[PDB]
Amino acid sequence: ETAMLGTHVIWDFGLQSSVSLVIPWISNAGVV
Amino acid sequence: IPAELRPGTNQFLTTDDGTAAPILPGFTPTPTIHIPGEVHSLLELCRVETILEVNNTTEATGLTRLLIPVSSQNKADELCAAFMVDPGRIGPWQSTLVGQICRYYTQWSGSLKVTFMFTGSFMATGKMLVAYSPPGSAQPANRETAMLGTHVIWDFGLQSSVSLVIPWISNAGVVTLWYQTNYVVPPETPGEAYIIAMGAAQDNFTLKICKDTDE
Amino acid sequence: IPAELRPGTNQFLTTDDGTAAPILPGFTPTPTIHIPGEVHSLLELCRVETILEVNNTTEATGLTRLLIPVSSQNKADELCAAFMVDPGRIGPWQSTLVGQICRYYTQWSGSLKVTFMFTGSFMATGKMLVAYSPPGSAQPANRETAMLGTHVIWDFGLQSSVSLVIPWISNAGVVTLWYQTNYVVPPETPGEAYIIAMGAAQDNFTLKICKDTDE
Amino acid sequence: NIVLAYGEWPEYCPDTDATAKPTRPDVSVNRFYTLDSKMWQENSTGWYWKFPDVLNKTGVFGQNAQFHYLYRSGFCLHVQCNASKFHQGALLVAVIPEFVIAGRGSPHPGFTTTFPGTTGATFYDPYVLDSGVPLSQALIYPHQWINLRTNNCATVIVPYINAVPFDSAINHSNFGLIVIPVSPLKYSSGATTAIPITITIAPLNSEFGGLRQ
Amino acid sequence: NIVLAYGEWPEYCPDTDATAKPTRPDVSVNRFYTLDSKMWQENSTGWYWKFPDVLNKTGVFGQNAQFHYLYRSGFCLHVQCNASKFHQGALLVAVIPEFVIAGRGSPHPGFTTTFPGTTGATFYDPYVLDSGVPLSQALIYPHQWINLRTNNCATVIVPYINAVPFDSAINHSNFGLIVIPVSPLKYSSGATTAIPITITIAPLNSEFGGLRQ
Amino acid sequence: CVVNRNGVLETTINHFFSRSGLVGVVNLTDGGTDTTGYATWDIDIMGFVQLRRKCEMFTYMRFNAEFTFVTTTENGGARPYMLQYMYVPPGAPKPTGRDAFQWQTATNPSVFVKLTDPPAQVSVPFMSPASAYQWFYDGYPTNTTYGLCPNNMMGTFAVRVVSREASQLKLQTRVYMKLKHVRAWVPRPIRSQPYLLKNFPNYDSSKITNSARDRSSIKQANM
Amino acid sequence: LETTINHFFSRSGLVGVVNLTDGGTDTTGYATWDIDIMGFVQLRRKCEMFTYMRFNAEFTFVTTTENGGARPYMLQYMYVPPGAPKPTGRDAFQWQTATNPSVFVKLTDPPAQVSVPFMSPASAYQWFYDGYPTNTTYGLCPNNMMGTFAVRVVSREASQLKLQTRVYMKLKHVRAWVPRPIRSQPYLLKNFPNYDSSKITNSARDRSSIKQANM
């Protein structure tokens, strides 16, 4: 529920077989 | 000025159009707002399709009386279900919307329609025959004598729901449900399913003299 | 001509619009002259600011209950006064004009304003915080949590009177009065002063169903 | 600056009957009448003056209002107190039409209590205005605050307010001028104890009809 | 495709009094709120969710509806269940305005029975909707069938339906979302027993007025 | 909870004095020699403290008045007896007996309505020599003479049963006054102190009742 | 024309019966009646087909004695608007408050008819409220109050009547917004939807088998 309030993507299996998520601006941390 | 009092002066006759004295003059009510809905007449309530208790037997006891059972142990031509078309008498049409607003409204006359839908697996395949007899005749004893009427060959693979229009009931007409082809399943698929029946009135359905309901 | 008497003939129903027979025909009253004043409605009486008994404690006994005391022994952030905004309930708004013409008139809804003015010496200097809380919340326990609302930083040197507008009460909202800076006086000047609170309704204040007062 | 009572700028009588006729006196009566200065102290409690009682038996207005049985006039009231920058307090200067002194103790008031003269009397209970009517709502009347850190003068211009356009100036008193300290007077030790309050009255549009003796 | 509740496309408040004023929040609150997935079994009996109770104390909508005493919003409801081609059954997904839980046994229901929260409660008697009112006629409400051989998703767009254009989002719950299996779930031995039902809520035109603390 | 605005037709000066309420009750008790057989009632609106507190919010008022007389017997059973509701205008003498000559003066407009009829309604115009009724007069008509204005007289009614030989009724007249075409000029604050007399503003200064009920401290808003 | 929403609620029926029983000291002498339409289960089942309703109401009071012989006694039918106190006795001061519009009609007259406007703070009457006014507090809406009547005989010295008032309500200008299904379960309480789940009565009467249309 506290991960649903962020930048989530509801990815299912029947419709799509592959999904992609764009991480904005890392630098030399962000957990997916 | 001269005036004469005709018979019927001091009576309180209900269903009258005489106005009454306002008890709070100068009172302004709260102004109305836009609320969705706005039922203008009860005639647009009896054309909403509602579920129909066809399986109104003794041992049903719950939500299992909205459902017409279809099995795979039944052979061809074996009469899945049958019920009269009487929106206002005692039977399946007592749980529907068109049949409960006409326990008021003494007379009624109009067209109806009955919608079936099938609740089996996606892999299952079969057929059904949906025949309507006129209100002069009884229900057919064979499938062949029901085929000679107003049948609809409804299958399961192509369509999942069919509808049949009943022309001009009045205050009876029996619609039946026959097995045309037995219920065919692949392996590892359950062999029992259900049909739920629906029903409403058409646009030319009207009502007449008011009456209190019998609960 | 024929006529029929509907129900409700011989009743004396108060709040009626039926005319009565004049008892002195041909009588001409004294012609009216121009008198100043001419109240056309009671709604222009409840927008005149009148004094508000905020200091309605037990030991007040006289004109010393119109006045909110401000002293110089009080430090900063110590809650000079607090009172609800209820024009029609029991409290400070029972001595005002807007709160006594609505012990009639069962319902009311509109905007108000509360005007303070300071009655100290010309040499004195300080500040006050005038915060209004919405009617869902209680009164603030700190000055910092009252600063995050609808505050007005009112000082004494620049302005001698400030006003705060309360939006849309209905039949509650608490307005408080905090010390922002302590009361600063030069030598040979008294250290106690007073604030008198005022209050009236705005232009969009309306009233509804009549009722006799409870004295 | 000035408070105008009910927004009128008082005028003469329009086209009334039984006057063709009444005399309109010149600035010999419309001068500035300055009454005495009342000393406002810590334990003071208010004052009131009845109009036109304060200008009877005083000057040209006294010789006209006592020898005429019709009367109509409007006034200009100027109340001013002289305080330093070390005193503090507030005065409520209002104009109450038909101001009736009640009488106290469960007992009618005397003549000098309701018609005080030039030396206007003092309140006994200023919280109820000596008429059972609270000071809290006394801002309906044309009023002006004299707060000693903001201003000192208050000017109210009052027209003729009556149901009859001509009455007698001796029996009937049209309005009253109250001056009540809502907030008391405080001062540090060494300052002047009593602060005077002087009042100046100028009649605007006085009329008199029917002469005696 | 979509069911539109009473044919409205919900909008903002037109020209109402006591608002000049209310805040119109951006897509920080109008995102897609995905609740938990309820497992639908053979002996399952239905569920119901109260609105806007399911989005109180949840995200930005929880911090706005708890600190505001006016509220007006419309929703978009998306119920979807993930089943294979070997399962079968039907769901009735309706939207009941002013859905009042009755109470049973000849005895008023508790707080968690009528205001269940995010985890919406289950029916005891789905045949009478737990309100003495039959499921047979429950197709008056804006509804959509989820038949597992035809479709999987059902989309209902609900406007704001109330006699007062602004109420509190904590005390009053405007409507309820029922999901009742009319036909039970059957499967051959070896398949997955529980089938999940996930719900996505997106507020359309939320308004809030008057801020606390 | 309330979001909209109410009506401004109900706050006006004519609707605030609109409805008709009870303003006076008299009793006849006809029968015999020791009883009178008539009952007069001076018209005044300052009889009950609910209409008195509303009309002393203003100084000058100008209105018409229409009256309605609801008469019952002592028990209620109304047999048809003919009544007389006279009207003595200000400046005319009141009756002195049930058979006096003031009942036959043609300048007193009387109303002959039986007991079984609907109540006798009649209307009275503006009856003052001035152009407005004064309820606060700061003057003398030339101790007990201060603040009396004789320009507020309206009249009496003098209810009487029309008969010849002393019917034994015991009646009770209730008078209902409706105020029409009301005009009020200068306002004044509503009275806080309780009333002591009927014609005077006396207020019993030995106990000054307060205009706001007390609370514990000035710093708590809960009252 | 007969199926519309205004003709379905058109006619006036009985909605409440009260009794006075005047006479003596142990008896009261007055009888109040709270205005509600959910008293009889025939108007309750019709009005709970909808959620929001907006209507006027006109009333007619048919009073007879215990036997029927009506001698002329003068009555008083008052009206206490919502927010005003009810009377406490037959000689209390609430009978002389001018803001309660009363009607003075004898027993021998035709019945006293009077009309009551829309008296709600909202813009529609709610018969189903899913909330709390802040166990027994759930589902109570105070926006449905309309008033009382408080029948009383006008006399002085305690007439010995025993009356019986019958109140007939006519619904005028009816507007109903959102519909809902008609109740099948019998009623248990007056203000609550409780239905006694230990016996669920069915909405269709039983038959022998599903394959026979004869019922």
PDB file of C-alpha atoms in Angstrom, chain C residues 38-49 97-98 101-102 105 107-112 200-208, chain F residues 5-14 16 57-58 187:
ATOM      1  CA  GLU C  38     -37.528  54.231   8.103  1.00  0.00           C
ATOM      2  CA  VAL C  39     -36.381  50.697   8.849  1.00  0.00           C
ATOM      3  CA  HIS C  40     -37.609  48.666   5.877  1.00  0.00           C
ATOM      4  CA  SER C  41     -36.415  45.270   7.153  1.00  0.00           C
ATOM      5  CA  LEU C  42     -34.788  43.687  10.190  1.00  0.00           C
ATOM      6  CA  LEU C  43     -31.867  42.538   8.033  1.00  0.00           C
ATOM      7  CA  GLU C  44     -30.313  46.026   8.100  1.00  0.00           C
ATOM      8  CA  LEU C  45     -30.332  45.986  11.908  1.00  0.00           C
ATOM      9  CA  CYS C  46     -28.113  42.894  12.211  1.00  0.00           C
ATOM     10  CA  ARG C  47     -25.283  44.530  10.232  1.00  0.00           C
ATOM     11  CA  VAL C  48     -24.678  47.304  12.781  1.00  0.00           C
ATOM     12  CA  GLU C  49     -21.626  46.556  14.915  1.00  0.00           C
ATOM     13  CA  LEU C  97     -27.697  43.098  18.021  1.00  0.00           C
ATOM     14  CA  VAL C  98     -27.146  40.290  15.509  1.00  0.00           C
ATOM     15  CA  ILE C 101     -32.861  39.348  16.579  1.00  0.00           C
ATOM     16  CA  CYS C 102     -31.996  35.700  15.858  1.00  0.00           C
ATOM     17  CA  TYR C 105     -35.881  33.245  13.025  1.00  0.00           C
ATOM     18  CA  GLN C 107     -32.422  29.176  10.784  1.00  0.00           C
ATOM     19  CA  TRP C 108     -29.626  31.535   9.748  1.00  0.00           C
ATOM     20  CA  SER C 109     -26.598  31.365   7.452  1.00  0.00           C
ATOM     21  CA  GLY C 110     -24.152  34.037   6.359  1.00  0.00           C
ATOM     22  CA  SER C 111     -20.846  35.794   6.842  1.00  0.00           C
ATOM     23  CA  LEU C 112     -19.847  37.929   9.832  1.00  0.00           C
ATOM     24  CA  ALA C 200     -22.058  42.265  13.078  1.00  0.00           C
ATOM     25  CA  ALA C 201     -23.193  40.245  10.074  1.00  0.00           C
ATOM     26  CA  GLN C 202     -22.257  40.783   6.438  1.00  0.00           C
ATOM     27  CA  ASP C 203     -24.473  41.469   3.425  1.00  0.00           C
ATOM     28  CA  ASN C 204     -25.086  37.786   2.574  1.00  0.00           C
ATOM     29  CA  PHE C 205     -26.608  37.004   5.989  1.00  0.00           C
ATOM     30  CA  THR C 206     -30.169  35.655   5.734  1.00  0.00           C
ATOM     31  CA  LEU C 207     -32.836  34.301   8.077  1.00  0.00           C
ATOM     32  CA  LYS C 208     -35.605  31.702   7.883  1.00  0.00           C
TER      33      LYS C 208
ATOM     34  CA  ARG F   5     -28.912  31.667   1.045  1.00  0.00           C
ATOM     35  CA  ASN F   6     -32.371  31.867   2.605  1.00  0.00           C
ATOM     36  CA  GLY F   7     -35.213  34.195   1.627  1.00  0.00           C
ATOM     37  CA  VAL F   8     -35.233  37.943   2.234  1.00  0.00           C
ATOM     38  CA  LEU F   9     -39.041  38.131   2.101  1.00  0.00           C
ATOM     39  CA  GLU F  10     -39.403  36.812   5.659  1.00  0.00           C
ATOM     40  CA  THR F  11     -37.149  39.379   7.399  1.00  0.00           C
ATOM     41  CA  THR F  12     -39.109  42.437   6.261  1.00  0.00           C
ATOM     42  CA  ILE F  13     -40.850  44.871   8.594  1.00  0.00           C
ATOM     43  CA  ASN F  14     -44.333  43.807   7.434  1.00  0.00           C
ATOM     44  CA  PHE F  16     -42.212  40.542  11.368  1.00  0.00           C
ATOM     45  CA  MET F  57     -37.645  47.934  19.218  1.00  0.00           C
ATOM     46  CA  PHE F  58     -38.940  51.034  17.394  1.00  0.00           C
ATOM     47  CA  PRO F 187     -34.891  51.666  15.833  1.00  0.00           C
TER      48      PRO F 187
END
